[PDB]
Every structure is written in C-alpha cells, then in structure tokens.
Amino acid sequence: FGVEPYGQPKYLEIAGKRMAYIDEGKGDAIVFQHGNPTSSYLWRNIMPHLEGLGRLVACDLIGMGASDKLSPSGPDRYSYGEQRDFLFALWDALDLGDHVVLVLHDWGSALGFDWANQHRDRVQGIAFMEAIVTPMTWADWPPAVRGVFQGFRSPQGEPMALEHNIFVERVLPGAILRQLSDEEMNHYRRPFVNGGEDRRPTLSWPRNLPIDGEPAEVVALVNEYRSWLEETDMPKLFINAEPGAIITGRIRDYVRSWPNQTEITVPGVHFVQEDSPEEIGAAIAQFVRRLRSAAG
Ligand SMILES: [Cl-]
C-alpha cells in the first residue's frame, strides 16, 4: 500500500478561497471525488491504474485536504450546498469536457451524482463505492457508529469534532480493516491538526446525512438524483464492499437493481480504498477501457 500522494498539488482561487487538486495526464476526464474526512489522498493507490486512460483529476473539498479553510467558520458553514458551490465552480474552471467518468465515494458521491444529474450529456459513466444513494434510517447505518453519528448530530458534536477530532481519530480507522501506517494516518490528520474550527467540515458533513427525514433539503436532493440513477442507461460500476458500511442490506439490494451496471464485491468497511485498492483500481480501468471501446 503506497504511502505517497499521487501527482503534484495544484491550486486555483475559487470564490475567494484556494482550492487544491491533482490533474495529471491527457484526454477525457476521470474525476475522483473523496468524502469525509478524507482528501484526494484517498485515491493515491487507485489513480495509477487509470494512467493512459484519461486526464486524472482529484479535488480537495473546501476545508479539506490542501484546500483553504472558510472564515469565519461556524455551524452555518460547510453545508452540502456550500461544498457544492465551491466544488462545482472548481470543476467548471478545470474545463473537464463532455466525456467525463466520475469515480465517487461518500459525500463525493452525493456531489458527483448531483453534478451528473445536472450535466447528463457530459458524463460517460460513473463508478461509485460506499455512496449516498437513498435517504436512510438509523437501521441502515452501521450499528457500531449509530451513537457517534447521533452525537455529531446534536450539541455534543462541537466538542466531539472540534476538540477531540473523533471523525479523524476514531471513525476513519474504525472503518478500515487493515491498520494504516503512521505515515498514512498522518497524511489524513494533516488538514485537521489544529483544534477548533479547522475541523468544522468533519462535523458539518455528518449533520447533512439524510437520516430519518432530516435535513429535508438533502433528503430532497438525494431523492432527485436517485430517481435519475434508477432509470438512466448511463453505464455504472458499483463497487460493493463486504462487510461494507453504508451500502448494505436493503440499500445494497436497491443499488443492485440499477440498470446498465457492472458490479464487483471487495473486502472493506467504509474506506474501501484502504483495503482493496488493487481490485478497485483494476475494476475502474476495465470499466473505462470498455467505455473507450464502445465509443470507437
Ligand atoms: Cl459524514
């Protein structure tokens, strides 16, 4: 398992803030989008498998990775909508073209599914894993972390995330089967070393999860994009994980019903890239080669 980040960090100023990203190679874009509490670092052992198959792009969400922190920060910042505002502006600035393959995880999947739904004629295929695909109930959520996530979604969330860094220190390793090396963990810790508001994105994200009907605007968003995913003939690559975390049970059955979908099942909990990068990267490469073939 490689420890070095992939590529060279690049930056653009987007809506007053510097956003960091990786952009390597030529061709049609293959866009990798991380979620909480990760960064483009999550994709470092996956991206090499796509070399020569396209222009490999991986952005760091606002407040995350090497991207700037918002200021002043507080409970009203880093909502889904704000995250979308920055990311969608960065993707526009990058001139991705009209044959995009998205490779999505966690909140990256909500953002990327929303983008694809809004730009259907520009997306060639979507690979996704451990993704937000439907409004949830607590029963859908991994038992081990129901209490923690409820905690984030209460006034206890500030000390949990801001002071104790629980998403980074506990949730992340808890949903990887292997033990990360110190070096790898320290890349994940890097954006969040300072206690306080630098950790806000890691709190705002769980507060946006669509669970038992709330928040209503994110439930609505997910219902809109999933209605399109269910009916579209756009090619899909569903990377299922065993035991998995957020795509299990009935949600796994639901996703399996979607059309024009290639499936794999690999070992992993939530951060599956850390347990099965070779399988995942190979699957994505195979999927993209089929798309290129079919495009002549
Ligand atoms: Cl989250």
Side-chain angles (χ1 to χ4, degrees), residues 1-3 5-7 9-149 151-178 180-182 184-223 225-232 234-296:
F1 290 95
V3 309
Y6 183 75
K10 302 170 173 48
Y11 305 83
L12 286 167
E13 295 185 306
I14 298 295
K17 295 278 147 194
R18 193 187 281 187
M19 295 187 78
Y21 60 99
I22 300 175
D23 178 5
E24 301 289 339
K26 312 184 218 203
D28 299 308
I30 311 175
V31 177
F32 300 77
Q33 192 55 62
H34 79 267
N36 192 38
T38 64
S39 71
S40 61
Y41 188 78
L42 182 64
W43 301 108
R44 71 198 180 285
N45 300 313
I46 293 162
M47 299 175 73
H49 285 86
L50 280 302
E51 293 189 337
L53 293 177
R55 175 195 177 193
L56 310 188
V57 173
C59 298
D60 291 345
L61 298 173
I62 200 64
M64 310 189 75
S67 295
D68 283 353
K69 305 299 182 174
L70 299 176
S71 51
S73 177
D76 54 307
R77 305 305 300 267
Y78 303 104
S79 66
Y80 174 90
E82 185 162 38
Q83 287 280 2
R84 177 181 53 194
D85 295 335
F86 281 96
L87 181 63
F88 284 23
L90 177 57
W91 285 350
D92 194 56
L94 292 173
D95 190 23
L96 303 167
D98 297 339
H99 297 89
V100 177
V101 172
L102 298 171
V103 180
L104 306 175
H105 183 51
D106 184 68
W107 282 105
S109 71
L111 287 162
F113 291 145
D114 184 8
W115 195 86
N117 189 220
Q118 299 195 48
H119 303 89
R120 298 171 183 187
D121 68 322
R122 292 178 60 199
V123 181
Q124 182 170 48
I126 306 185
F128 61 95
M129 61 218 78
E130 280 287 310
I132 296 168
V133 301
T134 194
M136 293 171 284
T137 75
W138 288 108
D140 297 309
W141 204 259
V145 288
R146 293 171 182 155
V148 67
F149 280 79
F152 287 132
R153 296 165 66 96
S154 83
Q156 286 274 312
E158 277 76 13
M160 293 171 73
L162 309 184
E163 187 180 355
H164 307 313
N165 210 15
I166 284 167
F167 217 112
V168 171
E169 296 289 344
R170 309 304 178 195
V171 176
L172 168 65
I176 301 164
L177 294 171
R178 70 163 175 126
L180 293 180
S181 67
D182 285 344
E184 290 166 300
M185 188 66 178
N186 285 333
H187 276 280
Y188 284 119
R189 287 169 173 142
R190 191 192 185 207
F192 301 121
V193 296
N194 299 150
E197 288 294 329
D198 282 6
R199 293 161 181 178
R200 180 63 66 177
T202 75
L203 179 54
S204 293
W205 276 138
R207 289 177 171 174
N208 280 68
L209 290 160
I211 307 170
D212 283 9
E214 309 171 319
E217 61 277 13
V218 175
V219 168
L221 164 78
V222 177
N223 281 335
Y225 70 61
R226 78 191 181 95
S227 179
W228 169 64
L229 287 167
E230 280 172 27
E231 294 180 41
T232 183
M234 183 190 56
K236 304 169 195 68
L237 168 56
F238 169 39
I239 298 157
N240 182 223
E242 278 285 355
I246 74 170
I247 300 178
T248 73
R250 66 125 192 152
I251 296 184
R252 178 182 293 139
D253 291 343
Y254 169 66
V255 172
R256 282 181 157 157
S257 77
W258 286 2
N260 200 20
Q261 185 166 85
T262 301
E263 186 180 319
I264 71 174
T265 292
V266 300
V269 181
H270 183 67
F271 298 98
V272 297
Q273 304 86 349
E274 301 296 359
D275 286 314
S276 295
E278 292 290 321
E279 292 85 354
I280 292 168
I284 301 158
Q286 292 162 205
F287 174 67
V288 174
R289 288 177 193 114
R290 290 167 61 218
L291 295 169
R292 290 159 63 99
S293 287

